[PDB]
């Protein structure tokens, strides 16, 4: 089932750890807006595959951290 | 050994060349012998050649490096050399190492 | 070498490792050479990461340029696998859950 | 204005996006995004 002025805030954390992918996603309506917000776990996928790069797939603004 | 020119061929079987400084072996013994550059595949694991039936054997699994290099200056002569020799003729196929 | 380049269990792993001898099936008179496993690799695979590329590998200074060279070598290297082979060269199917 | 830069994953990446319309479709994660070696690719649509 899909994940889905500017009302949407879409927070994603990705983490590949022992070749195990997670996403942890939450949806806020709405610079960052400084608030406090904890991210639920969405899915775990076993890729198993060395990620070195990322990109963003576009068909508004995102922001990236590490 | 690979940095020398000369060297070209130095193929290992079922061992990594990388890793030979790395890994650590009981005891490593070294064949020397001179052969045409035609039948230096004969000298191979599991590899059926009149030099390798008659002459030196290699067992199927056998753990190791084989190192080739060209030998025409320091064994090509005018006149040339009649004094290296290869057994034509046995009545069986040497066993491995024999 | 496979722990290194094949398959790393991680330090922490609960599980089983099952393994039984394959010998019958996964061997053949005139050899199985479809098993294929991985000598040369830059770095050390990490836990649960598996490698499928295919590349030519520069274990010295003068570049492959993607041919066969002197140090350059097929990452993969196929299994020989006889029915002649002793116990311990033979090969064995392992499951791991 | 069309900003989709490749960025390095690193450790680990969050990802905050503010859209209208959901214009962003998704993420590409590869180690040289190629196809000589695996990977990744998430596509999110209605
Ligand atoms: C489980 C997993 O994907 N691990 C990879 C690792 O293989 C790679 O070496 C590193 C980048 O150097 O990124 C991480």
Do not use: M
């Not at chain 4, 900003?3 to 959901?22: H, M």
Request: net charge positive; glycine share 6%.
């Amino acid at each position: 089932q899909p994940f889905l002025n500017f009302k949407n805030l879409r927070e994603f954390v990705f983490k590949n750890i022992d070749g195990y992918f997670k996403i942890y996603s939450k949806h806020t309506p709405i610079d960052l807006p400084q608030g406090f917000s904890a991210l639920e776990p969405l899915v775990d996928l076993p890729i198993g595959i060395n990620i070195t790069r990322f990109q963003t797939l576009l068909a508004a603004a995102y922001y990236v951290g590490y | 050994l690979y940095n020398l020119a000369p060297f070209f061929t130095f193929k290992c079987y079922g061992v990594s060349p990388t890793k030979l400084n790395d890994l650590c072996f009981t005891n490593v013994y070294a064949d020397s012998f001179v052969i045409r550059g035609d039948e230096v595949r004969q000298i191979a694991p599991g590899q059926t050649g009149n030099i390798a039936d008659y002459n030196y054997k290699l067992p199927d699994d056998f753990t190791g490096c084989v190192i080739a290099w060209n030998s025409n200056k320091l064994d090509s002569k005018v006149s040339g050399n009649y004094n290296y020799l290869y057994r034509l003729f046995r009545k069986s196929n040497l066993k491995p190492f024999e | 070498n496979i722990a290194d380049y094949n398959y790393k269990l991680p330090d922490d792993f609960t599980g089983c490792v099952i393994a039984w001898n394959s010998n019958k099936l996964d061997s053949k008179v005139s050899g199985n050479y479809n098993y294929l496993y991985r000598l040369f690799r830059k770095s050390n695979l990490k836990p649960f990461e598996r490698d499928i590329s295919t590349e030519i590998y520069q274990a010295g200074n003068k570049p492959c340029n993607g041919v066969a060279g002197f140090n350059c070598y097929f990452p993969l290297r196929s299994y020989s696998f006889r029915p002649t082979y002793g116990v311990g060269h033979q090969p064995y199917r392992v499951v791991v859950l | 204005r069309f900003d989709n830069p490749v960025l390095p994953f690193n450790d680990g990446v969050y990802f905050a996006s503010i859209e209208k319309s959901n214009i962003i479709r998704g993420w590409i994660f590869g180690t040289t995004l190629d196809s000589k070696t695996q990977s990744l690719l998430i596509v999110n649509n209605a």
